[PDB]
């Protein structure tokens, strides 16, 4: 009964303008299926459709439960609706994947790549995915991706699709208050509408009131990604919790929300993909002919302006100001990160984590053996002219000593830390009387050596 | 080995066929 | 043809990938009772891919499930070679 | 794989043969 008085919902009553065609409005429902204010004077009322989702067919059958939220919602009423009626932590991470409306296909072991690389570093942060909600594009391999792993939802996968309320077909099929509605995975291949992705957990449809058109959600989804950013971790060091930006493919527009992403405060890293095609080929491109950063030639510079206009079918002048918001995603070329196959986006997504997070190296490297990640600690905690605080790298090999890390004690040994400076007879006592670890049969036998000593 | 190889072999069948596309749009125009 | 008479075709020609590219059509009307009449012949005809497969697409066993309905699949003929008969009857004449 | 490798070889040493014909032939004529 919270999520009624709680949250709105809105609904088209307009004066039915015609423009195009007689039956549809400007909300471009049907004229005789009706029952912001500028042009469709909406009403707001409360809510309707919210509770669980039952899938049948598509796969396994999975409850994916959903709440209908108007579009000019404050996030701080939404974050309780995450966290006390829906009974899910604070994430570890969030990862917010973008890409294109249209559906595409990539290469094979790409989508294997993809696949396997998503999902482990889901599973290696507990991290929640942030899609666009419909079985479209990038998200028709989110959920595919899915397919691959399944299994460990009780580790909170936590795959929350924020999607429109008006392009999701069968609407009305989906009105409920806190009731279980079957849905289906039928896609009707004559109807513009498109269903959710099946194998999702949360829900956000957000009704701007229209139906059949896009950006009822661009604006709730970044308030709401900038507000669990300000959330503080559950290290209470003085970070919030990391929000990285996935990106495949995706069109022109995509490369405005880039620079949204990295002119903000606090800068959100961006992770790309390579041979999909499209705006995330042209932003590779750019990334490794690009010297010192926005320093581009001339001779690239129109090699860039003329796969614009093919790929992307463009003009002259709006392939050059495409060109000049690329440039202007160039000046921050360091919080960019390319993966390239040929391995996975494990290694990508970590990385990005890694140089989003701008905390401290012993603080990276305790988040490294938190991972049990060995690679990423390598490439990215020991760079070139990191600072190393006296007695940190010893606390470190403690700690690796004490977790049971072995290719981490390779690592400290391989990047200094003698091992004679290293000992005391103290640190060998606090290493020798530890918990974390494997089971230890030292206790019952120093047990019976201090009983049959005396 | 021949996972990679496998997948390799069907970009340059592809980018193939592209060759014979864009070599018959050259000889078609001269 | 009825799509209920395409899946029993199906079963006739054992081959379980034809149904799922093509009987189960976005959009194909399905008969009250038809789905459980195909599992029942997919269960009686020892077809486990097809049993997976209405599994997949619907078809719950909670409410599959009826006491005739697992007694007529319990006196069913075709299939593999059943044993149940000779071990029933030699139950029946030691109960009395 | 090395099944399906082997066919697609002798379909792609073939479109070379093909590619050889039509450079030489665009080489021709100018």
């Known amino acids: 009964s919270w999520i009624e008085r709680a949250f709105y919902k809105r609904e088209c009553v307009h004066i039915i303008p015609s423009t195009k065609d007689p039956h549809r409005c400007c909300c471009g429902r049907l004229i005789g299926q009706h029952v912001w204010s500028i042009s469709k004077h909406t009403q707001l009322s409360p809510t309707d459709a919210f509770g669980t989702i039952e899938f049948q067919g598509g796969g396994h059958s999975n409850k994916a439960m959903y709440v209908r939220v108007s579009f000019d919602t404050k996030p701080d009423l939404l974050l309780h609706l995450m966290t006390k009626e829906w009974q899910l932590e604070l994430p570890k991470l969030l990862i917010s994947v973008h890409g294109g409306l249209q559906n595409f296909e990539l290469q094979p072991k790409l989508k294997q790549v993809f696949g396997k690389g998503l999902i482990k570093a889901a599973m290696t942060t507990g991290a929640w995915i942030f899609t666009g909600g419909v079985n479209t594009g990038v998200i028709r391999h989110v959920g595919d991706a899915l397919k691959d792993h399944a299994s460990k939802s009780r580790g909170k996968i936590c795959t929350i699709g924020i999607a429109p309320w008006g392009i999701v077909e069968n609407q009305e099929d989906l009105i409920?208050?806190?009731?279980?509605?079957?849905?289906?995975?039928?896609?009707?291949?004559?109807?513009?509408?498109?269903?959710?992705?099946?194998?999702?957990?949360?829900?956000?449809?957000?009704?701007?009131?229209?139906?059949?058109?896009?950006?009822?959600?661009?604006?709730?989804?970044?308030?709401?990604?900038?507000?669990?950013?300000?959330?503080?971790?559950?290290?209470?060091?003085?970070?919030?919790?990391?929000?990285?930006?996935?990106?495949?493919?995706?069109?022109?527009?995509?490369?405005?929300?880039?620079?949204?992403?990295?002119?903000?405060?606090?800068?959100?890293?961006?992770?790309?993909?390579?041979?999909?095609?499209?705006?995330?080929?042209?932003?590779?491109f750019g990334?490794?002919?690009?010297?010192?950063?926005?320093?581009?030639?001339?001779?690239?510079?129109?090699?860039?302006?003329?796969?614009?206009?093919?790929?992307?079918?463009?003009?002259?002048?709006?392939?050059?100001?495409?060109?000049?918001?690329?440039?202007?995603?160039?000046?921050?070329?360091?919080?960019?990160?390319?993966?390239?196959?040929?391995?996975?986006?494990?290694?990508?997504?970590?990385?990005?984590?890694?140089?989003?997070?701008?905390?401290?190296?012993?603080?990276?490297?305790?988040?490294?053996?938190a991972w049990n990640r060995v690679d990423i600690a390598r490439s990215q905690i020991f760079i070139y002219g990191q600072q190393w605080p006296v007695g940190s790298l010893e606390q470190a090999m403690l700690d690796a000593?004490?977790?049971?890390?072995?290719?981490?004690?390779?690592?400290?040994?391989?990047?200094?830390?003698?091992?004679?400076?290293?000992?005391?007879?103290?640190?060998?006592?606090?290493?020798?009387?530890?918990?974390?670890?494997?089971?230890?049969?030292?206790?019952?036998?120093?047990?019976?050596?201090?009983?049959?000593?005396? | 080995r021949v996972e990679n190889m496998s997948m390799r072999l069907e970009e340059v069948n592809e980018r193939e066929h592209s060759m014979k596309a864009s070599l018959q749009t050259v000889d078609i125009r001269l």
Do not use: W
């Open chain 1, 176 to 284: 409920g208050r806190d009731v279980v509605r079957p849905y289906q995975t039928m896609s009707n291949p004559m109807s513009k509408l498109t269903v959710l992705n099946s194998m999702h957990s949360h829900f956000i449809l957000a009704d701007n009131g229209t139906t059949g058109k896009y950006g009822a959600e661009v604006k709730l989804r970044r308030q709401l990604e900038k507000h669990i950013s300000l959330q503080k971790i559950n290290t209470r060091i003085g970070q919030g919790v990391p929000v990285v930006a996935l990106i495949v493919e995706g069109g022109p527009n995509v490369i405005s929300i880039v620079l949204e992403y990295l002119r903000d405060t606090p800068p959100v890293p961006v992770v790309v993909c390579d041979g999909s095609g499209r705006a995330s080929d042209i932003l590779a």
């Open chain 1, 287 to 369: 990334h490794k002919y690009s010297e010192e950063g926005g320093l581009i030639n001339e001779s690239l510079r129109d090699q860039l302006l003329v796969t614009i206009q093919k790929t992307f079918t463009y003009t002259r002048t709006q392939a050059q100001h495409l060109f000049i918001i690329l440039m202007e995603c160039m000046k921050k070329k360091e919080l960019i990160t390319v993966f390239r196959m040929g391995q996975d986006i494990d290694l990508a997504i970590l990385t990005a984590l890694l140089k989003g997070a701008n905390a401290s190296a012993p603080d990276q490297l305790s988040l490294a053996l």
């Open chain 1, 401 to 454: 000593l004490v977790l049971d890390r072995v290719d981490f004690v390779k690592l400290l040994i391989e990047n200094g830390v003698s091992m004679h400076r290293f000992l005391t007879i103290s640190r060998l006592e606090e290493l020798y009387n530890t918990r974390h670890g494997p089971s230890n049969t030292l206790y019952h036998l120093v047990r019976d050596v201090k009983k049959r000593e005396y």
